[PDB]
């Protein structure tokens, strides 16, 4: 997967999307839909779907929602206040946590100002808490801005890694785009019938 401070961003495009294989897979620990309840996804069409991917702790999945606060939603990944898509999350302890600590999953814990929605910040400048200038060296009130989850397999739930995917359906002003499958029956012949081709 991808870090939490530099999430990925895949732009799903013109296709046949089947959110039912998602919705009923029962492997997801969290499947919330906000703009639109889940069962009506395979009956609508939009312009673009974006999919963002990252990895967080277990009890940080409640900050991936419109209108929250905390070190994740403040400055790592912010969701607008009129979100439309759905948020999916599942536990991944066996893949991402390794004995001795997996120190490759970082997050940002200091920033000047909270993110704009869907804004991204991969810089690595030395934070400056106090008034004293920092000059690119560490010290009191001059902190490196990235911390690392040290994931370990013997962690209580809520400290084990969860993988998160945020689908965001957007509708600019194009002519059309991806929609759900078009279930079709069988064609009969030699009988007065009511048809749709």
């Amino acid at each position, epitope marked *: 997967f991808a870090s939490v401070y530099a999430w990925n961003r895949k732009r799903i495009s013109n296709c046949v999307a089947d959110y039912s294989v998602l919705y009923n897979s029962a492997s997801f620990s969290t499947f919330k839909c906000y703009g639109v309840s889940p069962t009506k996804l395979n009956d609508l069409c939009f312009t673009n779907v974006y999919a963002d991917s990252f990895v967080i*702790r277990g009890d940080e999945v409640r900050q991936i929602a419109p209108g929250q606060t905390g*070190k994740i939603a403040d400055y790592n990944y912010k969701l607008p206040d009129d979100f439309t898509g759905c948020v999916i999350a599942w536990n991944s302890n066996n893949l991402d946590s390794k004995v001795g600590g997996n120190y490759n999953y970082l997050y940002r814990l200091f920033r000047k100002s909270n993110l704009k929605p869907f804004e991204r910040d991969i810089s690595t400048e030395i934070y400056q*808490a*106090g008034s004293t200038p920092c000059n690119g060296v560490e010290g009191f*009130n001059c902190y490196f801005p990235l911390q690392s989850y040290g994931f370990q397999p013997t962690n209580g739930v809520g*400290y084990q890694p969860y993988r998160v995917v945020v689908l965001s359906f957007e509708l600019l002003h194009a002519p059309a785009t991806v929609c759900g499958p078009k279930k079709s029956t069988n064609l009969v012949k030699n009988k007065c019938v009511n048809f749709n081709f």
Partner: antibody
Amino acid sequence: EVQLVESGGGLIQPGGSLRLSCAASGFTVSSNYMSWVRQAPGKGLEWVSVIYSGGSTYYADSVKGRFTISRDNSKNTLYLQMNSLRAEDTAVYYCAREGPKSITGTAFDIWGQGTIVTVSS
Amino acid sequence: DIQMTQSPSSLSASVGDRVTITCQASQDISNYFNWYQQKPGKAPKLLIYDASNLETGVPSRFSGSGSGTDFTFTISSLQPEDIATYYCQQYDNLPMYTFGQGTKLEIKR
């Protein structure tokens, strides 16, 4: 070279609106994680509140709805806007900076010697 | 939630000895655990953090260990310059910081 003095305390009746002024030196309080921690006489410590350096606020759920934190980023003062007591909040109130001291993990590393708040009229 | 209980409350320390206070918890954590020292009257100071890694200013004494449920704080003895109160802190992603009760120490003059 980094001690914060809090102005406040004094007695008061149940239902007051006293607020405390934690004024810091040596670092910006608009870029750190300042927090409040109280402890009752002859009891263990207890967390009260924290503010993140973007504006967010959190409360200890026993004192939520009655407490407020704010800061002055041009005066370096940290405010605990307290009101509507219940006369069990008689304690000594400490300020603390929450700063990382590892590749993973954070801690309270500088404190403010405490100020007494009493209530009973 | 997670509540940590410190078993031996205000033992007796003799000069030239050892002492091991002991604390455990709920559902396990890992290295998110700091030990504090509050003298009788002053503000608390931090002297452990994470689990070990002494603090810059603490002497060659005061070692700590344990990493999944049980954590043991150990002193090479009981310097008369102690008799303080020792707390334990944990924390979580969500705002929270549950301080465990704590002990005392003492001496045998």
